[PDB]
Write a protein that holds these residues in place. Structure first.
Motif, short mmCIF file in Angstrom:
data_model
loop_
_atom_site.label_atom_id
_atom_site.label_comp_id
_atom_site.label_asym_id
_atom_site.label_seq_id
_atom_site.Cartn_x
_atom_site.Cartn_y
_atom_site.Cartn_z
N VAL A 176 0.88 -1.15 -0.12
CA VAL A 176 -0.26 0.09 0.09
C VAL A 176 0.96 1.34 0.12
O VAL A 176 1.67 1.35 1.03
CB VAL A 176 -0.76 0.01 1.40
CG1 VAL A 176 -1.78 1.34 1.40
CG2 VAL A 176 -1.51 -1.23 1.49
N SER A 177 0.76 1.87 -1.19
CA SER A 177 1.44 3.48 -1.14
C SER A 177 0.64 4.32 -0.42
O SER A 177 -0.44 4.14 -0.08
CB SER A 177 1.88 3.91 -2.43
OG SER A 177 0.42 4.11 -3.18
N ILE A 178 1.20 5.55 -0.02
CA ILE A 178 0.63 6.59 0.56
C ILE A 178 -0.33 7.14 -0.41
O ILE A 178 -1.66 7.79 0.15
CB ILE A 178 1.66 7.68 1.05
CG1 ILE A 178 0.90 8.77 2.00
CG2 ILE A 178 2.24 8.32 -0.02
CD1 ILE A 178 1.92 9.78 2.60
N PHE A 179 -0.15 7.07 -1.51
CA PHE A 179 -1.07 7.42 -2.62
C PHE A 179 -2.30 6.46 -2.58
O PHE A 179 -3.65 7.09 -2.69
CB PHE A 179 -0.57 7.38 -3.98
CG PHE A 179 -1.73 7.63 -5.23
CD1 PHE A 179 -2.21 8.89 -5.17
CD2 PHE A 179 -1.98 6.72 -5.97
CE1 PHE A 179 -2.98 9.34 -6.41
CE2 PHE A 179 -2.90 6.87 -7.12
CZ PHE A 179 -3.46 8.28 -7.32
N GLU A 180 -2.37 5.11 -2.47
CA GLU A 180 -3.60 4.18 -2.25
C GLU A 180 -4.35 4.61 -1.19
O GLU A 180 -5.27 4.43 -1.17
CB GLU A 180 -3.02 2.89 -2.54
CG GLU A 180 -2.36 2.37 -3.96
CD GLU A 180 -1.87 1.18 -3.83
OE1 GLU A 180 -1.11 0.92 -2.91
OE2 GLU A 180 -1.94 0.38 -4.77
N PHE A 181 -3.53 5.11 -0.09
CA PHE A 181 -4.19 5.23 1.29
C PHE A 181 -5.21 6.54 1.08
O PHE A 181 -6.09 6.68 1.46
CB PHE A 181 -3.37 5.16 2.35
CG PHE A 181 -4.05 5.14 3.84
CD1 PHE A 181 -4.74 4.14 4.23
CD2 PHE A 181 -4.02 6.13 4.55
CE1 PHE A 181 -5.48 4.34 5.28
CE2 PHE A 181 -4.35 6.22 5.88
CZ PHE A 181 -5.32 5.35 6.07
N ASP A 182 -4.44 7.43 0.54
CA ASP A 182 -5.23 8.79 0.22
C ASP A 182 -6.46 8.56 -0.56
O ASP A 182 -7.66 8.93 -0.24
CB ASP A 182 -4.19 9.53 -0.69
CG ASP A 182 -4.72 10.93 -0.77
OD1 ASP A 182 -5.57 11.70 -0.23
OD2 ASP A 182 -4.18 11.78 -2.05
#
Ligand SMILES: [Ca+2]
Length: 290
Positions: A176-182
């Motif tokens: 999970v990247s920070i972009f996906e969690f965004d």
């Protein structure tokens, strides 16, 4: 250095695919050269003396190791399908995945330059959670992420956790990247009830459609054209973090609504009261969202 070689292999694999693909978004013909051009930019920037951001697990280097291995695996899948109904669907899903991989790389390395340690999430409560739990990191493996998320929003192990993973992991990388969690926390806001919102809207709601393009949903909604009030809602795969609600109006035309600051549950409840969003996927059951 091994990252430079890996970036070159990826750019070459994207060029092969691009040539093998010789329409409506998401389009591999569009996405393949766009992603390659971005990777060439990353390669140039990684020559610079600094610019890597904080090192160690989950930093820029780790992100690229995982990202380029996954981009290779997805590119192999595309190559194995392309000519030298099933096929249209498999290439649509892979186009969505490439649209996701492109959006992630553009979010975290715009112009080639890493910003994962500075990236800010759309929703403040989610931003605080990420920086407090994950620190400067821009990416975690799923199992670590499920653990960290669970300090605040625990999910039941097994099929429910796996469904959550399937929803969050836009690039199908296992990380999970920070972009996906965004994206996820934008879609399933508000934060205090995040996983209840996701359960009610994406696991137990017949109107939800994941991994479907605009054209596939239109084809799906046309089947409902004689039942005004039918609607489906899907995450946009071209404007990440937004929903696209497709619905059959009174006169039988297919319209679209895009939510802004209001949680999806609020949009659907208000659209129920107003008589617009009544029969999810044309089904008689409309779940109670209170
Ligand atoms: Ca991922």
């Amino acid at each position: 250095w091994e990252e430079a070689r890996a970036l070159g292999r990826a750019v070459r694999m994207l060029q092969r695919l691009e040539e093998q693909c010789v329409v409506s978004p998401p389009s591999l013909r569009d996405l393949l050269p766009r992603t390659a051009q971005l990777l060439r930019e990353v390669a140039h920037s990684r020559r610079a003396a600094g610019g890597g951001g904080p090192g160690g697990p989950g930093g820029s280097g780790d992100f690229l190791l995982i990202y380029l291995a996954n981009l290779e695996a997805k590119s192999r899948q595309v190559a194995a399908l392309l000519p030298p109904s099933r096929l249209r669907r498999q290439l649509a899903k892979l186009a969505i995945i490439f649209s996701h991989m492109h959006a992630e790389l553009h979010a975290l390395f715009p112009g080639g330059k890493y910003c994962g340690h500075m990236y800010q999430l759309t929703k403040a409560p989610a931003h605080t959670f990420w920086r407090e739990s994950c620190g400067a990191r821009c990416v975690l493996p799923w199992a670590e992420f499920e653990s960290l998320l669970g300090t605040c929003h625990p999910v039941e192990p097994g099929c429910t956790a796996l469904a959550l993973r399937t929803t969050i992991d836009l690039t199908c990388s296992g990380h999970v990247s920070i972009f996906e969690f965004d994206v996820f926390t934008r879609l399933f806001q508000p934060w205090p009830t995040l996983l209840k919102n996701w359960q009610l809207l994406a696991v137990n709601h017949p109107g939800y459609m994941a991994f479907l393009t605009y054209d596939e949903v239109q084809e799906r909604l046309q089947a409902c054209r004689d039942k005004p009030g039918s609607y489906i809602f899907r995450p946009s795969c071209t404007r990440l973090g937004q929903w696209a609600i497709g619905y059959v109006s009174s006169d039988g035309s297919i319209l679209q609504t895009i939510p802004a600051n209001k949680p999806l549950s609020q949009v659907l409840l208000e659209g129920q009261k107003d008589g617009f969003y009544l029969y999810p996927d044309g089904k008689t059951h409309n779940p109670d969202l209170t």
